[model samples]
Target: RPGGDTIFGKIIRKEIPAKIIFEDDRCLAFHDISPQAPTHFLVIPKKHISQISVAEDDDESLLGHLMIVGKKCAADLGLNKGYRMVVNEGSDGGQSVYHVHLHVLGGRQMHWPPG
Candidate 1:
C-alpha cells in the first residue's frame, strides 16, 4: 500500500506539496488540506505500515516513534491548550486509508466523546 496506493507515499517522495513538519530519520509529520483542528498534523513512518493491525513486533519502535513525532510537532506549534493523538484502524473500524498514520489535534479545547 505504501507504493502508490498511499497518499503518504507521495508526500514521502515529495511528490505532494505537504511540507514536512519534523523530518526525522525514522518518521515525519505534515499538514493536510483538511485540518481537523486549529493545528492538525499527521505523523507517519518512512517504513510502509499498511495498518497497525497488520504490523508486527518489528514495527513497535516505529509506532512509538510516530507518537513522539506528534508531541514534538505539537511543542513546536506551542499547543499550550493541550493536544490529542488519535490512531484509527480497520475497514470494520473507522480507518479509510490503508496507510497507517498518527494524527495530532490541538490549538483549541478538545471536545468530550470525540467522534
Candidate 2:
C-alpha cells in the first residue's frame, strides 16, 4: 500500500470532513466511510504510523491507547454487550489506508471468520 498522506491523514488534518466521535492529544476516533456493521468506527493515532506490523518501538503504548479509546468509544456508542477490534496490517491483510487504525465494529452479531 502507498504510504505518506492517506484519506485518513486528510481527515486528521481537517481537510476532509468526518463524523468525529472522539479526540485527544494522542488519537482521534471517527465514523468509517463504509460502515461494516451498525456501529463501525476507526480509531487512529495522530502520530501516523504506517501499519501495525511496521510500528516503531515507541508505538507500543500508542497501540494500547488506541485499543482503550476504541473500547471507550464503543461504550459511548451504546455497544454495551460486545464489540470487535481489528487492525489490518499490510496490503495482503486488507489495509487499504496506510495509516494505522483500529476498527471498532458492533451493534450486531459478528460471525466467525468474518470472511
Candidate 3:
C-alpha cells in the first residue's frame, strides 16, 4: 500500500491536530480523541507501509521503537502505577485506524477480558 490518506497520516502531517503527548525521531504518542479510559493514548510510527496484519520484519523494529516510546509517554502522562498497552490488529480485533499503533491506557483499574 502507498503511504496515502488516513487519520494517522493526517496526524503525522499536522493536517488533523491531535493532543500529542510525546515525540522523537522514530514515533509519536498522542491522546485518543475518543478515549476509553481516564487516560488513553495512541503511539504510532511516523511511517508504516501496510496494515497491521501485513507488517513485515522491519515493521517489528518500528513497532519496538513505538513500544519503547510508549513507556516514556506513559510516565510523562503519569501512568507510573499501572497501564495497558494494546495493538488491535484488524476490524475483528477492534482496530479503528488502518495504520499500526499501540494504545496506552490507564488511570483506573482495568478489568480482565476487555469487551
TM-scores for candidates 1 onward, in order: 0.90, 0.93, 0.90
Name the top TM-score candidate. 2
Residue range 31-113, candidate 3, lDDT tens digits? 99889899999998877544677888767778788888988888877887889989887777887778888898999988899
Q: Considering only N, C-alpha and C atoms within 3 Å, which residue pairs clash in candidate 3?
A: none
Q: C-alpha displacement of 32 in model 2, angstroms?
A: 0.6
Supply candidate 1's per-residue lDDT for 100. 88
Candidate 2's residue-wise lDDT over 14-94, tens digit each? 887999999898899999989999999999998868888888888889899999999999999999989899989886789
Please report the TM-score between candidate 2 and the true structure. Answer: 0.93
lDDT minimum window of 10 residues, candidate 1? 1-10
**lDDT (CA) per prediction:** 0.83, 0.88, 0.81
User: Which prediction has more favorable lDDT, 1 or 2?
Assistant: 2
In candidate 3, stretches whose alpha carbon ends up further than 4 angstroms from where it belongs are 1-3
Per-residue error for 34 in candidate 2, Å, reads: 0.6
Worst 10 residues of 2 by lDDT: 1-10
Cα deviation of 95, candidate 3, in Å:
1.5
User: Best candidate, lDDT-wise?
Assistant: 2
Q: What lDDT is reached at residue 33 by model 3? A: 86
Q: Which residue pairs collide, candidate 2? A: none
lDDT of 1: 0.83
Clashes of 2: 0
